[PDB]
Amino acid sequence: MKKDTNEIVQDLKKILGIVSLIKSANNEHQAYKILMENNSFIIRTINKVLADSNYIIKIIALFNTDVVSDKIKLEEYKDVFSFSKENVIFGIKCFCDITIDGIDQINNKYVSFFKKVLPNIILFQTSCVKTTQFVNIFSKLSSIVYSEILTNERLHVLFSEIMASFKTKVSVEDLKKRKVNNIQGLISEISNNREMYKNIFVEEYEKHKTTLISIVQCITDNYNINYKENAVDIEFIFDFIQEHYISKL
């Protein structure tokens, strides 16, 4: 699967390329043109990701070259991280039970873009969830995520402190001089320095957990985001992903 992990780096380059075209675009109508000119790529990729029950394990394999050299590891990874067509269906159904009464509906050209692709996402049609609802939740959520990452001040503070602490453990100047600036260089740096970057991640996460949970919980509260007409428990979600997913890497 050296070509399939090649597939993922090739897809991420084209994705980041779409992104840099949208960021540096003069207005919405230009970004909407940019998304439509990539219309078949975005729909093919979603469909291709969702039908590849091993896609997550192929992402792990970019970062652990030592996994491809051991089918026991790979298969103990497929036990945790492989998802089926019905897992995808189940996850879409669960997605539409999120309510965000905290902000009006979004209708810009991204939302109109979003509704043009969904009748071609095969497994989304299979779910028989109403497009109006799914679009509404997805557009409200991604509007919140992007707005909070750009505008939330506690998040900016926290990002700054993790950034500074990072710089005291890794020489970013010497990384830039060894040309670890691109996506491939960055992938290779992490995969060859696995144990360290993962310990850096764990330690920064543990040091800053209370802030991070608090910030995200205050976001879900301040937009009244519910799951099954109930408050969302960020702490429980984060501890959950930790015990069943992150810890098994």
Ligand X SMILES: CCCCCCCC/C=C/CCCCCCCC(=O)O[C@H](COC(=O)CCCCCCCCCCCCCCC)COP(=O)(O)OCCN
Ligand Y SMILES: CCCCCC/C=C/CCCCCCCCCC(=O)O[C@H](COC(=O)CCCCCCCCCCCCCCC)COP(=O)(O)OC[C@@H](O)CO
Number of residues that bind ligand Y (CB under 6 A): 13
CA neighbor of 29 nearest in space, from 117, 109, 107, 106:
109
How far is 249 from 143, CA to CA, in rounded Å?
Answer: 31
Encoded one letter per residue, x for contact with ligand X by CB under 6 A and - for no contact, window 30-49 reads -x----------x--xx--x
* Rounded least distance, CB 153 to ligand X, Å: 13
113 binds ligand X (CB under 6 A): yes
Which of the residues 179 through 208 are near ligand Y (CB under 6 A)? 198, 201-202, 205-206
The backbone torsions φ and ψ at residue 80, rounded to the nearest 5 degrees and listed phi first, read -90, -50
Query: Which residue has tokens 């970062």?
Result: 63
Rank residues 171 and 183 by Cβ distance to ligand X and give the closer one. 183
* Rounded least distance, CB 239 to ligand Y, Å: 8
CA neighbor of 122 nearest in space, from 96, 89, 87:
89
Task: List CB contacts of 107: < 8 A, sequence separation 6 or more.
Answer: none
Q: Specify whether the CB–CB gap between 47 and 122 falls below 8 A.
A: yes
Task: List CB contacts of 55: < 8 A, sequence separation 6 or more.
Answer: 49
136 binds ligand X (CB under 6 A): no
- SS3 for 62? helix
CA neighbor of 146 nearest in space, from 23, 12, 13, 39:
23
Encoded one letter per residue, x for contact with ligand X by CB under 6 A and - for no contact, window 3-22 reads -----x--xx--x--xx--x
Q: Which residues make up the interface to ligand X (CB under 6 A)?
A: 8, 11-12, 15, 18-19, 22, 31, 42, 45-46, 49-50, 55-56, 59-60, 81-83, 87-88, 90-92, 94-95, 98, 106, 108, 110-111, 113-114, 121, 124, 139, 141-149, 216, 219-220, 225, 227-228, 232-233, 236-237, 240-241, 245
Interface contacts to ligand Y, rule CB under 6 A: 198, 201-202, 205-206, 234, 237-238, 241-242, 246-247, 249
